[PDB]
Amino acid sequence: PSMGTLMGVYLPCLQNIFGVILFLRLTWMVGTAGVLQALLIVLICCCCTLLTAISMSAIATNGVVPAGGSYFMISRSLGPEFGGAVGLCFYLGTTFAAAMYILGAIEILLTYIAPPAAIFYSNATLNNMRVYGTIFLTFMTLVVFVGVKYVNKFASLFLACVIISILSIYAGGIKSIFDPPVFPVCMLGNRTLSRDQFDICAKTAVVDNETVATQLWSFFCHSPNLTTDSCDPYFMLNNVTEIPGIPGAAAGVLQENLWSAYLEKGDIVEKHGLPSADAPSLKESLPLYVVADIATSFTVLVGIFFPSVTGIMAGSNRSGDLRDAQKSIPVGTILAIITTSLVYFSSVVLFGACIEGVVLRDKYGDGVSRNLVVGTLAWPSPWVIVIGSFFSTCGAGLQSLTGAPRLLQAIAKDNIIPFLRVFGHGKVNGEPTWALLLTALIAELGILIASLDMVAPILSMFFLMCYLFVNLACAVQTLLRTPNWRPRFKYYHWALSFLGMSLCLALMFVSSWYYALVAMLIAGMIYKYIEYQGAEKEWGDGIRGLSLSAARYALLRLEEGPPHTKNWRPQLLVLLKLDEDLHVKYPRLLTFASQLKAGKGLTIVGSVIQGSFLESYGEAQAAEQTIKNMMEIEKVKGFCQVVVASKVREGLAHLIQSCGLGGMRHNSVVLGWPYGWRQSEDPRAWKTFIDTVRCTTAAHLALLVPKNIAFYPSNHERYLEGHIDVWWIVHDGGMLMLLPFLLRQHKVWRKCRMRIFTVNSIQMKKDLAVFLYHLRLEAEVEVVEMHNSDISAYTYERTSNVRRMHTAVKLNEVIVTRSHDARLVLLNMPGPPRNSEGDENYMEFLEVLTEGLERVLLVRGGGREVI
Amino acid sequence: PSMGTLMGVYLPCLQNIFGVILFLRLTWMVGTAGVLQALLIVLICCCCTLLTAISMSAIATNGVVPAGGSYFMISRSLGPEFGGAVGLCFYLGTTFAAAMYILGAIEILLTYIAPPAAIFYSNATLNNMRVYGTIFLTFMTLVVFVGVKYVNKFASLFLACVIISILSIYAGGIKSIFDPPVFPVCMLGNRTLSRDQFDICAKTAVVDNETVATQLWSFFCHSPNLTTDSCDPYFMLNNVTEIPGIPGAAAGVLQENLWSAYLEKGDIVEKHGLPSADAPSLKESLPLYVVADIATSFTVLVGIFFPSVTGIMAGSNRSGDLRDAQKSIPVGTILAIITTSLVYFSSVVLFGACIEGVVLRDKYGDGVSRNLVVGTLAWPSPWVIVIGSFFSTCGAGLQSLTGAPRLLQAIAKDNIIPFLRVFGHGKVNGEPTWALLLTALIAELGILIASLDMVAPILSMFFLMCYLFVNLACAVQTLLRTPNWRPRFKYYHWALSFLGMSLCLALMFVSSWYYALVAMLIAGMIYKYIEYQGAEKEWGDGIRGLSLSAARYALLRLEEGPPHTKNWRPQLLVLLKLDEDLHVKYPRLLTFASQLKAGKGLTIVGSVIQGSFLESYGEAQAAEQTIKNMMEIEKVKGFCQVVVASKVREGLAHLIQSCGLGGMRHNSVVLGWPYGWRQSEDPRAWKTFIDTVRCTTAAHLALLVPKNIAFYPSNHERYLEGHIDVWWIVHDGGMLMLLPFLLRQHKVWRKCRMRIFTVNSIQMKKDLAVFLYHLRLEAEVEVVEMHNSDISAYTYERTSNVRRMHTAVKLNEVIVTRSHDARLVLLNMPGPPRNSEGDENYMEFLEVLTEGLERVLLVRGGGREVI
Ligand SMILES: *[C@@H]1O[C@H](CO)[C@@H](O[C@@H]2O[C@H](CO)[C@@H](O[C@@H]3O[C@H](CO)[C@@H](O)[C@H](O)[C@@H]3O)[C@H](O)[C@H]2NC(C)=O)[C@H](O)[C@H]1NC(C)=O
Ligand SMILES: *[C@@H]1O[C@H](CO)[C@@H](O[C@@H]2O[C@H](CO)[C@@H](O[C@@H]3O[C@H](CO)[C@@H](O)[C@H](O)[C@@H]3O)[C@H](O)[C@H]2NC(C)=O)[C@H](O)[C@H]1NC(C)=O
Ligand SMILES: Nc1ncnc2c1ncn2[C@@H]1O[C@H](COP(=O)(O)OP(=O)(O)OP(=O)(O)O)[C@@H](O)[C@H]1O
Ligand SMILES: Nc1ncnc2c1ncn2[C@@H]1O[C@H](COP(=O)(O)OP(=O)(O)OP(=O)(O)O)[C@@H](O)[C@H]1O
Ligand SMILES: *[C@@H]1O[C@H](CO)[C@@H](O[C@@H]2O[C@H](CO)[C@@H](O)[C@H](O)[C@H]2NC(C)=O)[C@H](O)[C@H]1NC(C)=O
Ligand SMILES: *[C@@H]1O[C@H](CO)[C@@H](O[C@@H]2O[C@H](CO)[C@@H](O)[C@H](O)[C@H]2NC(C)=O)[C@H](O)[C@H]1NC(C)=O
Ligand SMILES: [Mg+2]
Ligand SMILES: [Mg+2]
């Protein structure tokens, strides 16, 4: 399968864009709104479609392109929810478009081709439209049922007819510039008379050597004798002129019809710039003037014109039979859009500058003798545009009735929405069976309105909803960094899709707010229903399934990307120690964690249970429930893991290195202090502690070792007088300065004074102060003398056993004489020794250091802390 | 702190609800819209506020009630995002309400109290309103700045004045029924003359024994002599009547003014039911008829009336100083609402049935000699209502200017929105300083409009937005089962909150669609900004923080509730085996998992690395990256865990029992088969396999042991001819029937025929078929003979070593002669023995069973499978 860009993307998109709105409703729109506002309408309606084409190209380039059609790409690149919601709005738009094309062909048949055939001679026109539209819809449905092959064969002919029509229009204009046609329109003062009835527009004619009243007189004056004075004042007071209706292109005409002329329902189409002496008038004369049919505005014209720029999704419709789709879909679509936009602009200016401003406003060509107003300027004859538009409308109706059921069948066989499974019951060949009937029924329900000017806004609403959803999906997926979404289009940026969504939403609300609300509610309902059904199909439950799907999506999206945050906040893993009877030994660790997190962040609570898994599952479940209850009491929102190991050491290690799912990992381990390690003889008291410390420093995790956890305050407790003391010695400054702030952020330490003690002094104070300004703690800074010999233990261990104890006891003396009355004391601990045997000496160091302090918390940095 | 329900909730809510709209704009609304549509407006505007009061009660009962005010409850019970968004709309509503009350007091001062004081004598009224409103706003701001204590002291007086006003109105009506007042209104045909200028309404009066033209003549006719014929035709053609303006209560008047009388801008207030002979008229007479001031409709009246039922959040405003708030806030609020609604209904009917339908439509009381139209019926004098409404408006303005800056200061000190931190810089006493200035500026910007009929819809938009957000939050949090949200209100149901949200949204869009769009965009912007800032504060990054917060919220919400799903879908844990050089040994396990999941669900991929953590972290990270790449290649979306253990057995156990976060856990373990176990001498080949099997059967997890994994198809492979074979023997029927369906759902097995082989036969076939109908697989069912002796191994092991082999070899013979050419064969495996030593015999059994089959997959149920 291989066909080029032109005959694969360009010509189908062109054939789908050029429609009936141009012939039947371009001149009327231009005359009612002027040339300027018409150009503005065309620009506004082309910008939304151009931004949507850019977003569609960004969709069509990422990855491989599915070979099914234009609905499979959207789904594959935006998810079943979005794609399903988009597909239904597009289906409804297409079926209503079929209805509109049938209505247009009926109007062209009953008004210009053969008026005598109308059955009903107000509401007679509406009933004729209803009857003939129903007959046409039935026959077209039968044709599509039996003869799809001939339609696909003859589809080129309709495009040939459209192109020949446009060429003839432009040839007629260019011939108009130097030698225009003749189409006299008659005038009464500054009113417009219907030339259909009268033989000639003249008050009196000379027959048999004398003057006699003409048909215009007998129609306006009921008396057939000139010597009468019982007629309306407007006829006798004003003259009767015959101005040419097609003045050749000039700068005087384009200057005349350049400003808006919005009429009201029932008003008279008047030629601004003719002498008129006002006077009352009878009520038997109104059937002789041309009348405005519907109320005209700006939003009305926007709504009526928009369905003439839709069809940009028809270019990416032979995706399977394409040579290189990534390079052939976007360029073809955008070139088709540009060609259509330039043709519309040129045609607006040409109509404005070539035709009278009073014959453009005859929606049905009443001033002229019931001709196609746009067909008046055409070189060969006004008969080429009539037949051309008739065949174009028939072909567009046939193609819409062919392409809507196929899309419905695709959506039904995709098994997204479950209640429309029957609509996928295709024939033996694949041609839909019970989707054609539903489509014909919806098209009939649309035909029953029987007025293009009322069917067009619904069509516009559905297509605008589809475009808005495509744009919004693209922008959001680009912003939030979805895992499988990376488009390769060059001229693409999420700002463009966002602007397109905004513009098409503005249009959707300008046309009719209530229709837009109904469309938005339908779209939201289908989106949520697709999401719920997908959740129930993946997991098993509806609501819990929704939560599981949201969690999985967030974790998967969070997986990709740089795994480092610009800031550092403690996300703890509280290693609780269960008793022999499975009771929490130190329930104050959970309280302290709740005070340090304040209910925001991640807090996992692990614990190891010695034994064997094969025979100890119930114990694990019971302990998990116990920890969950104890954790609910202390008001800390977190998860709870319980593992059953053979030795507690390896259980602790596995718990430290494996807790979380992907990016939701901990980065801080808060373990308690071993009590009675030197009292008892069992050496294992302090080996587990040292091993967990060494295992949490090799994973680059922070460390919080709250000593004397039995004296820490509870949540009901409150502090009124007291001062936190910080004793940052050398390293770990960031966290030593960030912990007391996050601590005092709690009501228990809501107003505890902070004092920063740091073992040129003025320069150091200035730096600490400038750093504190960003934090805003403003705690008093007191820098005591720094003796390198005393601090040689921290410097030597980071980057002499007898000396170690000396320095630790001198440091302890200083801290206990200058910080004894402190509420909470925070100081950083030195790293454990490299030699696995000096652990006793390291423990003695750590014990003699914090001698006397009532409550002391030791923090060890991980090294990856930034702030 | 303890005060009752009445003086703590009822009276403040009552004082906040009864406003100026009732006096200044009740009669006008009733006359323009009739009695029926007025009652409908009151009902529509009371239903939204009643449903909002029910939702607010449901909020006020769950948990403890914060003692701060009415904004802390909403925040504490709905989250910082919702509460912050609600607080700002409420602040804007309150400040614009202050503007409206100042405008009302100005109107009452310049129109009835003292008209000569107006500075400008159209736009003179607007300029007078602007100047005087600015002066009033300045003086009121200064008073609130200096004298809050006196305001809080005197707040009771304003309620006393309002109550006395209403009592006087009703006393006047009841006195009207039997002896009404005198207020003659003059008429011209069926037009309404302004009685202010004329001395008496009579064409001619008799002075000095003869008739002379009266002031009405000289005002309507410029000639002061009766003998003139140069006047307008309407004056001479019609009469001059003097009808009473206050007809006592009767059923004839309530019948007259019962249908709508919507006028247009500039129309004349006409008395339907008086003789009038039409005629043209001059243009110097229009300043003498009463005129309609603004265009009236239904939506206009809805918008103008709505700010008279707002203030239901003022009852829950002394939460701290309450005896028992859970029982005192809801009953008080709802009783205040009911009292206000009944007073409005009774007043609408009383006005309709007591006053002429032509003097109700004088917005400024022009027909009467510039009196308060509602003050005409009042027993003591019309002077009590004027002064009462003046003092009420002044008091309401003062209280709004006192209560808006306090709310802004609370929001600013809560540190939710960061850019308004300055507005919390209260005085030494707490009274706001730079929040009062901002509030006064916004109120001035609102005063510059200087028309109640244009300020009221903005107020309505803000309050409706606040109410809609409260209702939506309540309904959603009740539906999705938020963890900390359980209200105790009896008459509360999420359907009521949903209906309230719908009704108040309908109102918000009926009044003015564009205003509603602006309000909704403001609310959404503030919601998303609060969410982003909170994410950046909890975690550290903006976008990644958003993802982390969504994941944590979903997991926490999913934690609570029954942990069993009605359906069972496999969520796998693929235990890969890494090589000595850290390469995936069997990369086909990942392919098979991707074919069985099809990219939807949870798939964790664990692996154990022997060694020691203290010295093997880089190996773990490298292996994790390797597995991530290999898993991305095979197109399976899952997480990857790597642990470093000392012995692979306990690593596998810890991986089996601890993988996931809360509810996102696996329920199926897919491990491979040990190859070369009998070939090599190392006994550990089959001990790890048996141990993992026994460890995964004690955790109640399913088990998938794909044998001969080297012959399984790849993703590029396709199958055209072949038939899946199922050999369900006794147990594990649900999963043995669900696995092939989920398998064939993949394109690789898209059309492989399924054959169900099952070792009364007709009854069994009928049951299997009925079960298959729901699945819809419709696979052919062939039931072979079931010999109990051969099946004695499965029956004896679930619920003789020589016999075991016999039965296994006979079963293998049957399966290999009737299923040799099968594509994939699925049969359930028996459980491992209880005796830890018969493992060799169990392995020999499992090996001799699947002898000859090219591809065989064995499944073992967990026992908790439902479908
Ligand atoms: C077509 O002829 C009709 C009827 O002869 C013209 O209607 C009349 O046009 C004159 C302007 O030339 C209007 O006079 C102006 O009226 C406005 C508002 O009343 C006033 O402010 C101006 O100072 C001036 O008096 C006149 O009202 C209008 N007649 C009616 C009944 O409205 C019409 O303008 C002619 N031209 C068109 C339609 O382009
Ligand atoms: C107040 O007096 C005014 C002027 O005298 C009345 O206006 C005129 O009322 C009559 C009805 O009694 C209208 O006649 C009707 O007009 C409609 C539509 O044109 C027609 O369908 C009916 O068959 C009938 O002819 C007349 O049009 C109207 N005059 C104008 C200029 O509109 C008015 O109705 C009196 N009563 C009120 C306002 O309650
Ligand atoms: N079985 C366990 N499960 C979870 N965490 C543990 C376990 N054992 C120890 N820990 C962690 O190590 C810390 C040190 O406890 P450790 O057992 O060393 O001291 P102890 O229990 O107070 O008594 P001793 O020091 O005499 O053994 C505990 O607070 C806990 O954080
Ligand atoms: N180190 C490991 N990490 C993760 N999973 C493992 C590990 N070792 C074994 N397993 C699991 O157990 C299964 C059995 O593998 P096992 O080592 O028993 O057989 P083998 O490697 O094929 O060779 P042999 O049977 O001779 O040892 C593996 O497929 C895997 O699922
Ligand atoms: C009606 O048509 C006539 C014919 O063109 C207009 O012109 C008038 O012709 C008479 C004949 O001599 C002259 O006396 C008048 O002076 C002409 N009018 C002007 C303005 O020159 C006539 O004006 C038309 N009437 C109206 C109301 O347009
Ligand atoms: C104007 O007022 C008079 C006084 O009430 C109306 O009544 C007419 O009075 C004259 C005096 O004899 C009678 O002849 C007429 O028959 C009375 N009218 C009727 C209907 O009985 C008079 O009708 C008023 N005019 C209008 C237009 O309402
Ligand atoms: Mg120990
Ligand atoms: Mg082994």
Residue numbers in the entry:
A (entry chain A), B (entry chain B): 116 to 236, 244 to 881, 887 to 926, 1014 to 1081
What did the published study say regarding this structure?
Potassium‐coupled chloride transporters (KCCs) play crucial roles in regulating cell volume and intracellular chloride concentration. They are characteristically inhibited under isotonic conditions via phospho‐regulatory sites located within the cytoplasmic termini. Decreased inhibitory phosphorylation in response to hypotonic cell swelling stimulates transport activity, and dysfunction of this regulatory process has been associated with various human diseases. Here, we present cryo‐EM structures of human KCC3b and KCC1, revealing structural determinants for phospho‐regulation in both N‐ and C‐termini.
To gain further insights into the structure KCCs in an activated, non‐phosphorylated state, we took advantage of an N‐terminally deleted variant of the closely related KCC1 transporter (KCC1Δ19) with deleted N‐terminal OSR‐1‐binding motif H/RFXV (residues 3‐6 in full‐length KCC1 (Austin et␣al, 2014)). In both structures, TM7 and the cytoplasmic halves of broken helices TM1a and TM6b of the core domain (coloured in orange for KCC3b in Fig EV1A inset) are peeled away from the scaffold domains (TM helices 3–5, 8–10 in wheat in Fig EV1A), locking the TMD monomers into inward‐open conformations. In line with an obstructed ion path, the KCC3b‐PM map does not show any densities for cations coordinated by highly conserved residues of the cation‐binding site: Y232, I148, P443 and T446. This interpretation is further supported by density for a putative cation coordinated by the corresponding residues in the KCC1Δ19 structure without N‐terminally “plugged” ion access path. Inspection of the electron density in this region of the KCC1 map suggests that either ADP or ATP are bound to the Rossmann‐like fold formed by β‐strands β1, β2 and β4 and helices α1, α3, α4 of the KCC1 inner lobe. Combined dipole charges from the converging N‐terminal ends of the three helices and multiple side chains create a positively charged nucleotide‐binding pocket. Weaker density for the γ‐phosphate indicates that a mixture of ADP‐ and ATP‐bound particles may contribute the observed densities. LC‐MS analysis of denatured purified KCC1 protein confirmed the presence of ADP and ATP in the sample (Appendix␣Fig S11), nucleotides that are likely carried along from the cell lysate during purification, or introduced by the ATP/MgCl2 wash step.
